[PDB]
Amino acid sequence: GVTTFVALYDYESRTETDLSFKKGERLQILNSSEGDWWLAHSLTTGQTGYIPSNYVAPSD
């Protein structure tokens, strides 16, 4: 099922596989919310990559 989040702070990509996003973006994960780093897709920008859980909060 869909599992969505909203970004609380801007995050700038620093690796080959993470995902830059801005505060307020809507993001969905493509597996479970276990752990601290999630493969995600931005509904806002269309881009994908790993995001840190401590930058986002659940969004229905």
From Swiss-Prot:
Binding partners and assembly: Forms a complex with polyoma virus middle T antigen. Interacts with AFAP-110. Interacts with GJA1 and PXN.
Q: Which residues form the SH3 domain?
A: 1-60
Describe the family membership recorded for this protein in Swiss-Prot or TrEMBL.
Belongs to the protein kinase superfamily. Tyr protein kinase family. SRC subfamily.
What cystine pairs are annotated?
none
| Parent-protein start and end of this portion | 82 to 141 of 533
Expression across tissues: Expressed to high levels, and with a high degree of kinase activity, in certain fully differentiated cells such as neurons, platelets and macrophages. Isoform 1 is widely expressed. Isoform 2 is expressed only in the muscle.
Q: What is the protein name for this chain?
A: Proto-oncogene tyrosine-protein kinase Src
- Functional description taken from the UniProt entry: Non-receptor protein tyrosine kinase which is activated following engagement of many different classes of cellular receptors including immune response receptors, integrins and other adhesion receptors, receptor protein tyrosine kinases, G protein-coupled receptors as well as cytokine receptors. Participates in signaling pathways that control a diverse spectrum of biological activities including gene transcription, immune response, cell adhesion, cell cycle progression, apoptosis, migration, and transformation.
Q: Which subcellular locations apply to this protein? A: Cell membrane; Mitochondrion inner membrane; Endosome membrane; Nucleus
Name the domain of life: Eukaryota
Q: Kindly list the organism's lineage.
A: Eukaryota, Metazoa, Chordata, Craniata, Vertebrata
Posttranslational modification, per the record? The phosphorylated form is termed pp60c-src. S-nitrosylation is important for activation of its kinase activity.
